């Protein structure tokens, strides 16, 4: 092509969305945003094909511009806004709060949470660097730049972010024995505990994870997301607790 | 006798309405008009007829039963606000807008883009020229 594409064929859309192949010819193309295209759920899909509150695109537009939907504690009006993993969606009129977490099948599951849980989210530390004026900052998996991080917070760690103000309440190191969640690959959506981080210079690191059933599997480090210490997750987990 | 049955009822305060599936049992009868069904749903839900919408009704093979989808808005103004234009026209809540065929509108749009500005000066110019 000669420039960015603006259309997405239904057969080319991510499989986990569950879009009927015969319903139409095109699927919602996620706009630019915090999460990548393939790992995101546009709000139209969530409101129409998952919650069934809206019957087609147009009532979804109506709902959004009514400002009844809040993502990340902020009102969003773009139908194709790319909501993604660990994003908090609030519908105050219905008094409903959702956290986007994959099921064991690998599909974003409608997981209802309390307001107290909705007050905070988790972000994997993708980068830690000194910015201008010598101010350290951390970039999380959702593109949030948080300045003046705790200097122990390192790459691959996870930080608890307050939605209202966007500061780091607490953090978890990436160590053996911590509780992790798989965000990619065939093991997607599984929950377990670390056993070893196998390290390859100049190559992709590999992590061995043991589930509650004692089964062990290996996944690339990029697909691992720490969510707590064993037996004490910092977020409510979906039904099944990431087993199988 | 005709039986009207509502199932899978979901309250949608985002659209301020009631969404549900309508099952119509009509023994010894071809089918029930959308108007009459709107009357009965309005009476059942204690809401204005204007706030009740029904569509997508299919008679099951062999007759005697129909299944479709039904909406009951909290009040009439919200229905006018949220209904599609065509359904309002079906219910008469809105008047059909009269427009030319797509080809005529497009041809007029072409003729309009050809002319630059108001065109009155062009008219007076051609008048003086001839």
């Amino acid at each position: 092509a000669r420039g960015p594409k603006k259309h997405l064929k239904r057969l080319a859309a991510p499989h986990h969305w569950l879009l009927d192949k015969l319903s139409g010819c095109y699927a919602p193309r996620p706009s630019a945003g915090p999460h990548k295209l393939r790992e995101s759920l546009p709000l139209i899909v969530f409101l129409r094909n998952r919650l069934k509150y809206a019957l087609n695109g147009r009532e979804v537009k109506a709902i959004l511009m009514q400002r009844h939907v809040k993502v990340d504690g902020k009102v969003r009006t773009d139908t194709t806004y790319p909501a993604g993993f660990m994003d908090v969606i609030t519908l105050d009129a219905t008094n409903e709060n959702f956290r986007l977490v994959y099921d064991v099948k690998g599909r974003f599951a409608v997981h209802r949470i309390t307001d107290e849980e909705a007050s905070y989210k988790l972000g994997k530390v993708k980068k830690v660097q000194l910015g201008k004026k010598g101010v350290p900052y951390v970039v999380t998996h959702d593109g949030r730049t948080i300045r003046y991080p705790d200097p122990n917070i390192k790459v691959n760690d996870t930080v608890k972010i307050d939605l209202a103000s966007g500061k780091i309440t607490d953090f978890i190191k990436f160590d053996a024995g911590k509780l992790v969640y798989v965000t990619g690959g065939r093991n997607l959506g599984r929950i377990g505990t670390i056993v070893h981080k196998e390290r390859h210079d100049g190559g992709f690191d590999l992590v061995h994870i043991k589930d509650s059933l004692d089964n062990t599997f290996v996944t690339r480090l990029n697909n691992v997301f720490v969510i707590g210490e064993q037996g004490k997750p910092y977020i409510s987990l979906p039904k099944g607790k990431g087993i199988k | 006798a005709v039986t009207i049955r509502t199932r899978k009822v979901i309250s949608n305060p985002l659209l301020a309405r009631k969404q549900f599936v309508v099952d119509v049992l009509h023994p010894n009868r071809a089918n029930v008009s959308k108007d009459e069904l709107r009357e009965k749903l309005a009476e059942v839900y204690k809401a204005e007829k204007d706030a009740v919408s029904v569509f997508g009704f299919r008679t099951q093979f062999g007759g005697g039963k129909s299944v479709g989808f039904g909406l009951v808005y909290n009040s009439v103004a919200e229905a006018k606000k949220f209904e599609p234009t065509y359904r309002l026209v079906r219910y008469g809540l809105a008047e059909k807008v009269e427009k030319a065929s797509r080809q005529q509108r497009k041809q007029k749009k072409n003729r309009d883009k050809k002319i630059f500005g108001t065109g009155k000066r062009l008219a007076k110019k051609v008048a003086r020229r001839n």
């Binding site: 209802r112 949470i113 309390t114 409510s236 | 005709v2 009207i4 049955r5 199932r7 009965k40 009476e43």
Partner: peptide, 16 residues
């Protein structure tokens, strides 16, 4: 922490 607990009924009329 525990997830939030889970939470209109059919109505019938006969005429004619």
């Amino acid at each position: 922490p525990r997830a939030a607990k889970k939470r209109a009924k059919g109505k019938n009329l006969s005429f004619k």
